[PDB]
Design a protein around this ligand. Structure first.
Ligand SMILES: [Zn+2]
Ligand SMILES: [Zn+2]
Lengths: 425, 152, 145, 48
């Protein structure tokens, strides 16, 4: 029954995930009708909103728990498949812990040592002759027993810990599990203050596909954007340097005349002033400063004003806009190019759609019958599903090449028709 | 058993003579697991497929393909074929079965988005021999994924 | 129906001037650019609404005392202390100000939330006033190209 | 335009030999042949 419940949350991960979003929406909709005298609730003559909030918070925490369990059941085995597969390939075809012994960096590799000594290293990679093959490959050049010592309702009474410490160190490094734990922590602290449930509305970026593409444009050049803002800060620092050296007397943000002075005479305060109303004014720093009507620094203050405008207000904004629009156009170029390359050419061979279309529809025959991504994967899965004794000469040759990783069997620049053109051949 | 096939001594009443199991005036469903037979059919379908694809242009065999069309329609989804460079320095076909679990798991769920992301990242980033092992890693992770999704 | 109800009120005949989009070819091509990405445009405005909802949440939790749109001092208060009214205020003069929400709010001269109100102001500016506008402009120009 | 510049230099270097200007069409009849041409025979490095 436990296994059925776990398979349920794994299989129903996306549905419960979509459900918690709308519970968060319902919470934050009821949050609009709050008041003060302390943050009470005053409805439009309906006293049912508080029990709905009380039960929906409990549902939110519960369904966050179930989504976390679904993620733990479902997506964790895949990334561990990738990890143990990588570790096995590094042990076999590189001999990492035999020869390399990697540095303090590559903290994955430094972490992936205690797994090596375990019995259940090849737990999900479906290749168990790893220790034996490494013993065959380095049994005499480095050692034999060196390799072996390097390598090797009644359910809750015996289980490994050596492999599982490594596994938990893996899962506590994964990003989506960390996000779901953050989601759970916000749903729990929603009990402490119901305003914390508003954090869960930011899951729309993960949820919706098109919104992820809306966000990719600004994400595509975030580094250059932050450099633009840093340059803006440097420029405003130079401007307030020029002000603090010269233009302090105009920096009078007091009331009408004959008043106590509320001035910017220091350097830090003037820098905060320029960053706070020099750029956030729509017109520059001269708007929020006493006008230079007949001063010796009239032309210099005018130069200061217009240069501040035409550089800070204009150029850096236009650069940010150009960055986001260039991200848009470049992602359009990316998808245009992938459609181009897939239409022109075989994914497998790279012939081009020129040799086959002599015959009608031939390129599509090539992609949809012979040199298929699907049929190739199904032959892979077939031979993983098959037994090595039952292999033909063809399948034995190919399985040899698979587990020793050649990829020469794959066609490239050739095909059955190119070999066997209908010319008595 | 009137609409699915015609009715003769040798089509329907043949089955009803094979279905002479019970004396309760009934028939159990064990006649179907008894009849088993399509494992022969796949291999003969593959035999005729290899014979046709490698050796076309023969009216005499084309006659028999007309006979075996009804079985080839049955075995077409499960019968895969691929081409690979051989030990004799030549491309040739490898005819091989396809399951339905891998097909249904490969087609409908989220794995199509994974294939789209795979093709996109491959052809954008690209590589000389950083293409086929990426394809095989995608295939192995996907095989594990379809296995895990079959497990529910 | 608009031409018939023009009898009931002659101002209803102004609805028929919107037939220029159907009539003229080049105007249909002028309109196709904004029509080409209307869905992503509406998503941009929805994201703007979500962002202003977060901003007025941060205001209603913390920054209520500055939300005094009354006359000069010693006056009855015309304030935004609720959440719905503050959200309408941010959507009505936070974005429709050319400068953000800090323009239409009492300046934070020497407060404990001075730096936090400053962060609120500049982040409201550089996100709401800038990025979503630039995304709308990029959408229409990308439709053109 | 600077994006177009770098796109074009990557295009021209991938398509063609820096030395010869054959194009990546005569050599790829053999597997990997264009890269043999650029990395063994007609090298900027080995020439220098
Ligand atoms: Zn091909
Ligand atoms: Zn050359």
């Amino acid at each position: 029954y436990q296994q059925k419940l776990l398979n349920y949350f794994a299989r129903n991960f996306y549905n419960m995930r979509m459900l918690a979003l709308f519970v968060a929406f319902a919470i934050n909709f009821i949050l609009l009708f709050y008041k003060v005298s302390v943050h009470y609730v005053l409805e439009e003559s309906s006293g049912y909103m508080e029990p709905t909030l009380r039960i929906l918070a409990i549902l939110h925490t519960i369904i966050s728990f179930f989504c976390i369990i679904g993620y733990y059941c479902l997506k964790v085995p895949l990334v561990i498949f990738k990890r143990e597969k990588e570790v096995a390939r590094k042990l076999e075809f590189d001999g990492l812990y035999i020869t390399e012994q990697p540095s303090e960096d590559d903290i994955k590799g430094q972490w992936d040592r205690l797994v090596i000594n375990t019995q259940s290293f090849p737990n999900n990679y479906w290749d168990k002759f790893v220790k034996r093959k490494v013993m065959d490959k380095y049994g005499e050049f480095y050692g034999r027993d060196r390799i072996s010592e390097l390598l090797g309702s009644a359910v809750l009474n015996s289980i490994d810990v050596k492999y599982q410490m490594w596994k938990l160190g893996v899962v506590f490094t994964d990003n989506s599990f960390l996000y779901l734990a953050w989601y759970m922590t916000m749903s729990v602290l929603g009990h402490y203050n119901n305003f914390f449930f508003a954090a869960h509305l930011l899951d729309i970026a993960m949820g919706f596909k098109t919104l992820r593409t809306i966000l990719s444009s600004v994400t595509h050049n975030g580094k250059q954007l932050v450099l633009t803002v840093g340059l803006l800060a440097v420029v405003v620092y130079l401007y307030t340097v020029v002000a603090f050296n010269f233009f302090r007397k105009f920096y009078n943000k007091s009331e009408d005349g004959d008043t106590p002075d509320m001035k910017c005479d220091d350097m830090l305060t003037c820098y905060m002033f320029h960053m706070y109303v020099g750029v956030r004014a729509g017109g520059g720093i001269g708007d929020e400063i006493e006008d230079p009507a007949g001063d010796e620094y009239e032309i210099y203050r005018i130069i200061f004003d217009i240069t501040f405008f035409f550089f800070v207000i204009v150029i850096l904004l236009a650069i940010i806009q150009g960055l986001i629009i260039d991200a848009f156009g470049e992602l359009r170029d990316q998808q245009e190019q992938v459609k181009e390359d897939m239409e022109t050419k075989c994914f497998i061979c790279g012939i081009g759609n020129d040799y086959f279309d002599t015959v009608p529809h031939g390129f599509e025959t090539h992609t949809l019958q012979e040199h298929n991504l699907a049929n190739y994967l199904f032959f892979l899965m077939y031979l993983i599903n098959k037994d090595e004794t039952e292999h033909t000469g063809q399948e034995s040759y190919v399985w040899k090449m698979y587990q020793e990783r050649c990829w020469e069997f794959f066609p490239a620049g050739d095909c059955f028709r190119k070999q066997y053109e209908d010319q008595l051949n | 058993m009137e609409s699915h096939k015609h009715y003769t001594q040798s089509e329907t009443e043949f089955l009803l003579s094979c279905a002479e199991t019970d004396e309760n005036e009934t028939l159990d469903y064990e006649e179907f697991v008894k009849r088993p037979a399509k494992d022969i059919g796949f291999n003969v379908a593959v035999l005729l497929t290899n014979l046709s694809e490698h050796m076309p242009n023969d009216t005499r065999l084309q006659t028999f393909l007309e006979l075996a069309e009804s079985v080839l329609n049955y075995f077409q989804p499960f019968l895969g074929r691929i081409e690979i460079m051989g030990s004799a320095k030549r491309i040739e076909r490898v005819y091989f079965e396809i399951s339905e679990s891998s097909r249904t798991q490969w087609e409908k769920p989220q794995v199509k988005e994974s294939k789209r992301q795979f093709i996109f990242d491959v052809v954008n980033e690209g590589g000389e021999k950083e293409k086929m092992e990426l394809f095989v890693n995608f295939c192995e992770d996907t095989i594990f994924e379809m296995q895990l999704a079959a497990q529910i």
